[PDB]
Structures are given as structure tokens and as C-alpha cells.
Amino acid sequence: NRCLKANAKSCGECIQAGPNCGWCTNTTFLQEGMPTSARCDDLEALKKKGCHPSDIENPRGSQTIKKNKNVTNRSKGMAEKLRPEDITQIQPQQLLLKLRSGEPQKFTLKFKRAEDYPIDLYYLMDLSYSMKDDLENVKSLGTDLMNEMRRITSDFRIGFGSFVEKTVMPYISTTPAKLRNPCTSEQNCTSPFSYKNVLSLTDRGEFFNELVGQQRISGNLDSPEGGFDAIMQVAVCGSLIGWRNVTRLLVFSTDAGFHFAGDGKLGGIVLPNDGQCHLENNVYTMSHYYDYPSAIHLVQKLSENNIQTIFAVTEEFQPVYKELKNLIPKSAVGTLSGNSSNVIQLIIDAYNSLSSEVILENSKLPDGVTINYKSYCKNGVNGTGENGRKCSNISIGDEVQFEISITANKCPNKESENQLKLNPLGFTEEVEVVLQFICKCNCQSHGIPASPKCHEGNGTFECGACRCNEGRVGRHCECS
Amino acid sequence: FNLDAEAPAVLSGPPGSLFGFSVEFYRPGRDGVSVLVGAPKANTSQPGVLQGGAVYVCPWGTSPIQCSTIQFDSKGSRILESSLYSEEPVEYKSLQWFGATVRAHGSSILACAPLYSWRTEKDPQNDPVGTCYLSTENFTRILEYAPCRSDFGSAAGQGYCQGGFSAEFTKTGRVVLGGPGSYFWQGQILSATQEQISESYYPQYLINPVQGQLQTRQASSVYDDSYLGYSVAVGEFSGDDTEDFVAGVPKGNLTYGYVTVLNGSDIHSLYNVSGEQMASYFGYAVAATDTNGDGLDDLLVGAPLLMERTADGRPQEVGRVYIYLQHPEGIEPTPSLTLTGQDEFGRFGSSLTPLGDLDQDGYNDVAIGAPFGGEAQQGVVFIFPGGPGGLNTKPSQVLQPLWAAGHTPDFFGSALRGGRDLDGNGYPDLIVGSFGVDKALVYRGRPIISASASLTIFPSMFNPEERSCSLEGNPVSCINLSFCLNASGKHVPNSIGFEVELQLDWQKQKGGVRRALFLASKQATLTQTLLIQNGAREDCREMKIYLRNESEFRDKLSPIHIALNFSLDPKAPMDSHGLRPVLHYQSKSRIEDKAQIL
Ligand SMILES: *[C@@H]1O[C@H](CO)[C@@H](O)[C@H](O)[C@H]1NC(C)=O
Ligand SMILES: *[C@@H]1O[C@H](CO)[C@@H](O)[C@H](O)[C@H]1NC(C)=O
Numbered sequence A: 001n002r003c004l005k006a007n008a009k010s011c012g013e014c015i016q017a018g019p020n021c022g023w024c025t026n027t028t029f030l031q032e033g034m035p036t037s038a039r040c041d042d043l044e045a046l047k048k049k050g051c052h053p054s055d056i057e058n059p060r061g062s063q064t065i066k067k068n069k070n071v072t073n074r075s076k077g078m079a080e081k082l083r084p085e086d087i088t089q090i091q092p093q094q095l096l097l098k099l100r101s102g103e104p105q106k107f108t109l110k111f112k113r114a115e116d117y118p119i120d121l122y123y124l125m126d127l128s129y130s131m132k133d134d135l136e137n138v139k140s141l142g143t144d145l146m147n148e149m150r151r152i153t154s155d156f157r158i159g160f161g162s163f164v165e166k167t168v169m170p171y172i173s174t175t176p177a178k179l180r181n182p183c184t185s186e187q188n189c190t191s192p193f194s195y196k197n198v199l200s201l202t203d204r205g206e207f208f209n210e211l212v213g214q215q216r217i218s219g220n221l222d223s224p225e226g227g228f229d230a231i232m233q234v235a236v237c238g239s240l241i242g243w244r245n246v247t248r249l250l251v252f253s254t255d256a257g258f259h260f261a262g263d264g265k266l267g268g269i270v271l272p273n274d275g276q277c278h279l280e281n282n283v284y285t286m287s288h289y290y291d292y293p294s295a296i297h298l299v300q301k302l303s304e305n306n307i308q309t310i311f312a313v314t315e316e317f318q319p320v321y322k323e324l325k326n327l328i329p330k331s332a333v334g335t336l337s338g339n340s341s342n343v344i345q346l347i348i349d350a351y352n353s354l355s356s357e358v359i360l361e362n363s364k365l366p367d368g369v370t371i372n373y374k375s376y377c378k379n380g381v382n383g384t385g386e387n388g389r390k391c392s393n394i395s396i397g398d399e400v401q402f403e404i405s406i407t408a409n410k411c412p413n414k415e416s417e418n419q420l421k422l423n424p425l426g427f428t429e430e431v432e433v434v435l436q437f438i439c440k441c442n443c444q445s446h447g448i449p450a451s452p453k454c455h456e457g458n459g460t461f462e463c464g465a466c467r468c469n470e471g472r473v474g475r476h477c478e479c480s
Numbered sequence B: 001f002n003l004d005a006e007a008p009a010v011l012s013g014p015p016g017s018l019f020g021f022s023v024e025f026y027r028p029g030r031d032g033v034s035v036l037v038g039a040p041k042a043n044t045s046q047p048g049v050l051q052g053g054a055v056y057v058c059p060w061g062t063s064p065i066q067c068s069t070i071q072f073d074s075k076g077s078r079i080l081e082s083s084l085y086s087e088e089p090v091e092y093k094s095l096q097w098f099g100a101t102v103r104a105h106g107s108s109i110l111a112c113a114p115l116y117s118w119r120t121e122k123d124p125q126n127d128p129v130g131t132c133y134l135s136t137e138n139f140t141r142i143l144e145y146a147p148c149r150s151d152f153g154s155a156a157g158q159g160y161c162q163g164g165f166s167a168e169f170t171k172t173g174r175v176v177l178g179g180p181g182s183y184f185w186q187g188q189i190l191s192a193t194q195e196q197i198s199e200s201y202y203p204q205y206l207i208n209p210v211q212g213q214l215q216t217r218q219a220s221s222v223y224d225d226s227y228l229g230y231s232v233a234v235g236e237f238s239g240d241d242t243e244d245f246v247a248g249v250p251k252g253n254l255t256y257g258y259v260t261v262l263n264g265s266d267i268h269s270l271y272n273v274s275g276e277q278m279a280s281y282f283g284y285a286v287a288a289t290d291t292n293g294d295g296l297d298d299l300l301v302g303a304p305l306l307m308e309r310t311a312d313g314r315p316q317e318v319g320r321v322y323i324y325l326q327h328p329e330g331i332e333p334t335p336s337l338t339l340t341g342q343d344e345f346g347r348f349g350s351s352l353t354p355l356g357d358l359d360q361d362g363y364n365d366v367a368i369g370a371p372f373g374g375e376a377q378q379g380v381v382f383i384f385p386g387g388p389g390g391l392n393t394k395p396s397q398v399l400q401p402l403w404a405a406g407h408t409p410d411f412f413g414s415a416l417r418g419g420r421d422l423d424g425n426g427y428p429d430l431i432v433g434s435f436g437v438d439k440a441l442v443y444r445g446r447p448i449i450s451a452s453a454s455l456t457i458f459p460s461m462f463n464p465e466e467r468s469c470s471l472e473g474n475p476v477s478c479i480n481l482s483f484c485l486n487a488s489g490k491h492v493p494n495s496i497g498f499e500v501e502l503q504l505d506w507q508k509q510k511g512g513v514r515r516a517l518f519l520a521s522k523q524a525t526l527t528q529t530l531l532i533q534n535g536a537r538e539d540c541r542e543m544k545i546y547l548r549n550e551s552e553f554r555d556k557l558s559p560i561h562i563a564l565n566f567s568l569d570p571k572a573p574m575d576s577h578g579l580r581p582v583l584h585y586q587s588k589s590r591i592e593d594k595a596q597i598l
């Protein structure tokens, strides 16, 4: 047997060795000559050998849900009731499960998308000359979005941010392109900028029109696609923006592609992106020093902020952002009209498409433990052979019930428990599972250090015999 | 393997000026053999240009390796007075990188300077044409090579070519040059041997095309933003001895990069393989050597940014390098090996250069640098070993910086180049650069000694009754113990010292009675220094061993184990290059034998 092959000295390397492996507090079956290994073996083998049932120590893990909230089901519309409230979507929020090496501990969790959940929207569009025909109408429908999205929730705030290219040498200067457009008489058409936010997340609909009417454009740069730095600084720091911890959105209005990390090396830029907010006076400043985010450094800090990015791509460059969609989980790509006149219906359908989709994710797993996933979604589509962290096609208010099995393995983290959080992307509330392993038998708590049976203090007597100190061997640690 | 990580033998650079951004060997295995280091952001001599940068030669070969600066061009006459006008005189040459891509073969060296900026004749612009400075025949004369500086200089033409971003001297003398931003950012490869550039140079023409010139043609508008020429290398992919050029296109094929190989005497598409993940930067670092031991070189393409979802499912930033194995048909198929990384943000595959036969078994090594790998994300350089079936995933030596953690990254392994021997003992030496703060490491390759030791006993059994030997006049039972040693190693001094330790009845516990003792020394252990001739026949030492009296021990059943251990003598002087030889990893340093009692 493997437990016999484990060559156990203490209860530890008999628990860590395997699930069925077990000790015996009597230790009268054990022969004096045979080493400490022979105690540790399978449950059935112990009862065959004649060891008593209480004398075996095989603790088995269990699940205990400390924190449970009643999910919100308050009636509205049909009957008079108070509308404002707080948020609750996942029923188990904090639960404790004790683990054994090789024990497939299992629990269940349930979630439903709460109706009338307030949202935050953010517009990120490139003030490039290819957007001259789009800025003219986008500013007009700032309040139209205010009116149209009233179905989704009682209230929601919406802000504006602008960017174009970068001030690096290779990507800043233009072809001859003799246009010389008299943009304005106030000389407000300033040079291209890395990023700038003008309006934060605010409920006042009039603020969009008032503060975006005074938004200018940048003049005809050659292949300017510097957006990922902007969508990095937006997601990385939200206190300055005002980013509130509800279901949140971001609009990326684009033309003709993007860049990714390792492009600034053409411009003499070698350091990667910090991942630290650099916004002095509402404008990106530490631009020339740091390179672009890699497509994946973006993914980590977009997922760690529950940011849902929406893509406003124009017809030509659709496939590239389409593959972006499969790269970045919880993101959507939409075919924008030529004049950007369909952005309202685009945002409506994009929010509808994102809402039905709930994807789960864990964080920083310990080495031994592994997690499998099964999902019971809508009516049908119960698939788990293809790994299920997602469901869709749900209606508003539908019930889903994922299942999580946490399977332990060879675990050296005897530092009591480890905290890990399971969170559906896009929702602040997460299930955190305090996950404690068993690295000691209960009989070890009563062990006598330097016990007289251990050749006059040359070891610790626990669970029926002695664990020898360093440099001591024998049944009673009699020998050095 | 062995490369002496304990003795780095560092160089150093000026403060606040990045150093070792390109490090290359110069005149290897010959007189005045030196190491070239590039510092593109360093200060130069001319007052007009700031952050001009210059490469420093270093007369390597002494215990202190301090070194001065070589002067490619400390002038201002060429730039000034374009069409003789003080008003709007020049677009300033300052901030031009000068050491991003330096390389040398033979006596002629090139120092490409990307981010070079110049104003065309027609109209003021900010065109980053890029130039490479060429000096030949022991710095006798300097040459200027800016093939992307032409009449039709515009952002849609060659204005933003930035030629010089990747170069390497071919073995035949050709200079192969890569301009990433040519023709509205599709890239252009420029190649012309030294004869045409030497003959067709004229200083006073700012625009002077090279007559013999091989360039990639302008492509259609559908291939925009591909960046051909980001990394280029030379190989032997064509069946003939003619060297073929390999170039990786990072953002081609709708962001799925791909790498091309080109015909020798005429630029052509030939063979070309694509990336497997979008925004992977396939072709950041291309490489090509005989990593198979078959005579036909193999490609090596690294993708620093990549996916590998794991048991948690969280995406990470792990780069993998790709091995493409050539075949007698000459065509490279789909990938045949893949050496991925294991660090969170280490851009594995950022640098890929070969080493030639460090173990001298006919198989050539490689070195891959992770500029942000390892703990404290300081930088790691791996060395995967060549094998009959290709590289081995186990990276053998994993070289780490010896300094302390700093606020800015130290960018270890952001530039390296090995290959040709430097010390001169037939063993190649590797180099790495760490442009974080003024750190360039030049390493050394230790000699290898393959040693064999054989232990014999005659007779194998002690006879208590046969007391054939006499100990102080007392007849004792004795048997003969003889051990032989044979060692062989290339480029090693003819005499090698070994330390040989003999132990008797070693399995007896500390304090137990040793049943067998040396006849001469009356002890249980013998240590001795031996000098074995390199490649000579085995040297044998014969000794007699005797068993103690039966009254002194009770154990006649357990055999008397005899152990033979050997390792290199730690007091042996280092070689002329200061290296200590290493025992081969297959050499069994411990040989055990046993004698019984009848
Ligand atoms: C929102 O929830 C997050 C949990 O991720 C918390 O850090 C933050 O303080 C919360 N904000 C508010 C206003 O409750
Ligand atoms: C839409 O953009 C096109 C440019 O392709 C322009 O000709 C047209 O007038 C625009 N239409 C509106 C309603 O702005």
C-alpha cells in the first residue's frame, strides 16, 4: 500500500501521503521491530488488523456557510414598494470548508442578476480626424442616451474621455496631406494628446452636452492607434474618475487597429507599463517614459477591476477586434455605423449581450489545490464536459446554480487556512472560501514534549508512540 | 554543463546612461581580442548632439577590464549647411540612438543608429530615416550607410524607415539591414556587400544610393502595419552553402506575426511561418544555427508576450520560443519544439543567440534571456543544451544577477551574444548586458574533464586462517586493493591533479569498529593527490589491506564495503584565463566495492 510506502513518522506525512491513510492511537498492533511506517494504511486494512475504530484518526472535510444573505426578491411595478435598496446577487458569501489531501470537497452556490442594478458608463473615443463625422453627432446624443437607457435602471452616470496617438517621435508627425482645415476661430484645436478625461461619471444629463460641445479634434495623423495606454489608465485608477462599485461599462470608439507592448522600442521606449495611475490634472502625463500595455497586462488589470469594455469599431477593421474579443474575457465588439449614428442601439444591444453572460474566476490558487467547474444554467445548456465557467441566454431574473469542487493534493501550507476568492467578472460581491487543510491529527494536540517514554525526553510521544527528534532513531528514540 | 557563474568579470558604464544595450565579440581568438559594448543613450563628445551615444571597445584580457571610447563620428560638418542656409540649418541629430544594433565580423564593424532624424531637401519634415556607421580595416576609414535616405523620402515612402533596427554581418561580408518603418510601416530589408558600399560612397551627396542593392519591394496597402525587419538573422536554409536571410514580421497577418526566409542572391519570399496567438510579437528575436547536429541550420523564433492559462485559469505573461527544424527537402514545417517560460512577467524569448558546442560534443547550445524573469524580476538567462533530437527543456545553467534589487529594472539579458571563442582555449564564452544601471557581464567557459576510476580487489574474500601478511611481526590476513584512474579532456593542461579518497567499511556507524584497516597507515581512510596525464593510459595504485583480529569484532556476515571517491583538486592553479576545470556530469565520482570474510 502507498501509505505503507509513505514511511510515515508523524501523523503529518501520513495525512499528506494520501486520503485513505490513517493512524492508530493504540499502537499495540504495531510490532516493536517494524518502523513507524506500518501504522499508516487504508481504513479497511486497519479494521482487518484489529485496530479499534476510535483509535483510527481519519478526519473528513465538510462545508460550513458562515455568511448567508437572503437574496433580494422584493416586488416592484405590480405592487407599491420602496425602490432604492442595496445589492445581493450571490447567496453564499463567506463559508468555511476543511480539506484533506485527495478529498474532493464539494459545495454549491447560486446567483441571479438583480434587476434595476445601477450602472456606470464611460466613453473613450479617439479625437482623430477620421472621427470628424462622428464627433458632430455623438455630442448631440449625450442626453439621448440619458433618456433611452432609463429602462435599464432608475439612475446611472456617464462620463467622457478622449485620446489620440502619442507624443513619441515615430508615431506623431504627419504626411504633407495639404488640407489645412479651419477647424475653429478660438484656436482650441490643440496638438494630439495621449489621454484626457473631460467629464467624470455624473448623473446630470445636461453636463454631457455642455462639456462635450467644447471637444475639439486632432488633425490627420498617419496611422494613429494609441488607445491601449488610455484604456489602461482608465481601468487602473478610478478614484479620480469616480468609478463606483456597480456593474460598470466602458466604450472604446475606434478606427483602424491598435498597438501593443514592444512598439515604443521603435521610439526608444523600453520600460513596461507600471500599472500605476499617472493622472496629473485630468491628463495622462507619464506617457513618454513607459511603453504600451501588453494585450494581457490589460487583461489582468481589466479583470481585477470588473471593467466591462465595449468596442465601437468601424467596418474595415472588424476582424482584429473580433479576435480581441476572444482574447479578452467579458468584452464585446460591435459594428458601428459609418456616421456613428447607431451608437445608442449599439450600446443597448451590447449591454444586453454582456448581461446574459456570467463568467467566473478565482485568484491565486495554492499549489496543491485544483478546482473543477460545473454549471446548471437556464433550461438546458448544462454542459460541463466542455469546461463551464459561463452561462448565457438567460432572461432577466433567471436562476443559475454553479457547483464548485475543491480537490486538495500534497499540501505543505500548514499555516492554517488560505483565503481564495471566487468572483463572477463584473460583480463586486464575491464568494471567498476560507480553505483550511488538516496537517495534524487530533491526538497530536495532547502530545507530551520530551516525554519519559521517549528514552527520557528524547522525543515527543503522540498518537500512541514517539516522534523522534533530529538525530534520534528507534521505536522509543533510544538511539542517537 | 559549465560556464563559471561565480566569477562574473563585470564591466561598467557611465551613470544615467544605459549600457550594454548591444554587446558583441570583436576579432575572436586573435590578437587584441576585444569586446564591443553599445550605449545608445550615453553622452558623446560633440556639443551639438545630446544623448548621442557611442560604442566602447574594451581591450579584454586583463584582470581590470576598464575601457575607453572609440570615435565613429565626432563631427558636425556633414549635418550643417544643407544647401548652405544658416536659417533653418538642420533638424538636430540629438537623442539619436547609436548602439541599439551594433555588430562586427572580421575587422569591419557596423554601428547602426536607429531613431536618426533628418530633414529632406524638398520641405522641412521630421523623417526618421536612420543610418548605420560602417568602419573597415582596423578603423582606417569610416563609411556612412543610410540606404533609406533617398529622394522619395516621405512617411508613405521611406521617410520613417528607421533602417538599422536590426542587422548582422553575414559570413561572406554582406551587411544585412532591417528597416521596420519603411513604406508606411510594412518594412524593408536592405543588403549590399562591402564592395558596393565602399565604391559607391560619396560624402557631399546626402542622398547617395548604393548601386548593388537588394531590397524588398513595396507591398500593397493591405499589408500596412507589419514592421518587417524588426529582427533579422542569417543562416543556411538554402541547400547550397549560400547564406539565406531570415526576418520576422511582428504585426503582419492581422497581428498574428510571421517570420520569412529569403533567397540568397535575390530577395524572394521562399519559406515563411506564422504565429499562433494574436499580439504575441512573433519575430521579436529570430535566430538560426545548427541546433540539430545535422549540418542544416534551424530557426528559432521567440514570442515574449503570450498566453498560458493554468490550473487556476488566470492568464499570465509567459513567452515561449519556437524551434523549427530544417530537413533535407529544405522546408521548415510546423513547430517541432517549444520552450515556454515559467515566470509571471518575464518576457521569455526577448533575446535569442546561439553558442557553439560548449560541451564540444558536436551539438550547439542556445541562450534565452528573460529581462524580467526570476525573483525580484531582475532578469534571467537560461542555457538550453543541444541534443540529438533537439534542445532539452531542462535549462541546465540558470544564470542570475549578483547585485541587489533596485527601483528601476536592471534588464538583465536584454542583450546578449555568444558563439565565437574569446578566451582562446577552444571553449566559447557568453556575454550578457544589463542596461538597467551600467552592467555588462562577460562570462567564461570552463574546460571539461571526463574521468574514469576503477577499483579492484584480489582476492574478493578475506580468509581469517590465511594470515599471509605481517603487521609489526604479527601475521595478519590481507588482500590486495588496487584502483586505476583515467581522465581525458580537450584544451586542458597535459597534467591534471585529482583528489582520491579511499574509505574502508564506510557503512559502519560512527563509532563502530572498522573491520579492515590499511596495512601501511593502520587507519580506515586514505587521502592522496594524484597527477594524471591528459589522454594517457590509466594510472594504477596497488595497496594491501588487512582484516583485524576476530576478537576485535563480532560481525563476520556483513561485507566490508570499500568506497572510492574522487573530485578535482581544489588547490590546482587556474588556467591562463583564470578558469577551474569541471568534472563531467556523467563522471561517476563515487565507485564502491566490497570484500567479504570467508
Ligand atoms: C465597492 O466594493 C469594493 C469591493 O471590491 C470595495 O473595495 C469598495 O470600497 C466598495 N465601494 C463602495 C462605495 O461601497
Ligand atoms: C457620414 O460620413 C460620410 C463620410 O464617409 C459623409 O459623406 C456623410 O455626409 C456623413 N453623413 C452624416 C449624416 O453625417
Ligand SMILES: *[C@@H]1O[C@H](CO)[C@@H](O)[C@H](O)[C@H]1NC(C)=O
Residues within 6 Å of the ligand: B015, B016, B017, B018, B041, B042, B043, B044, B050, B051
Ligand atoms: C550627457 O549625457 C547624459 C546621459 O546620461 C545626460 O544625462 C547628460 O544630461 C548629458 N550632459 C550634457 C551636458 O549633454
Ligand SMILES: *[C@@H]1O[C@H](CO)[C@@H](O)[C@H](O)[C@H]1NC(C)=O
Residues within 6 Å of the ligand: B032, B138, B139
Ligand atoms: C588597430 O587598432 C587597434 C587600436 O589599438 C589595435 O588593434 C591596433 O593597434 C591596430 N592595428 C595595428 C596593426 O596596429
Ligand SMILES: *[C@@H]1O[C@H](CO)[C@@H](O)[C@H](O)[C@H]1NC(C)=O
Residues within 6 Å of the ligand: B253, B256, B274, B275, B276
Ligand atoms: C493568417 O494567420 C492565421 C493564423 O492566426 C491563419 O489562420 C491564416 O491562414 C493566415 N492568413 C494567410 C493569408 O495565410
Ligand SMILES: *[C@@H]1O[C@H](CO)[C@@H](O)[C@H](O)[C@H]1NC(C)=O
Residues within 6 Å of the ligand: B240, B242, B263, B264, B265, B266, B267, B268
Ligand atoms: C536562389 O539564389 C540563387 C543564388 O544562389 C539565385 O540564382 C536565385 O535567386 C535563387 N535560385 C533559383 C531560383 O534557382
Ligand SMILES: *[C@@H]1O[C@H](CO)[C@@H](O)[C@H](O)[C@H]1NC(C)=O
Residues within 6 Å of the ligand: B252, B253, B269, B270, B271, B272
Ligand atoms: C509568405 O510566403 C509566401 C511564399 O511562401 C509569400 O508569397 C507571401 O507573400 C508570404 N507572406 C506575406 C504576408 O507576404
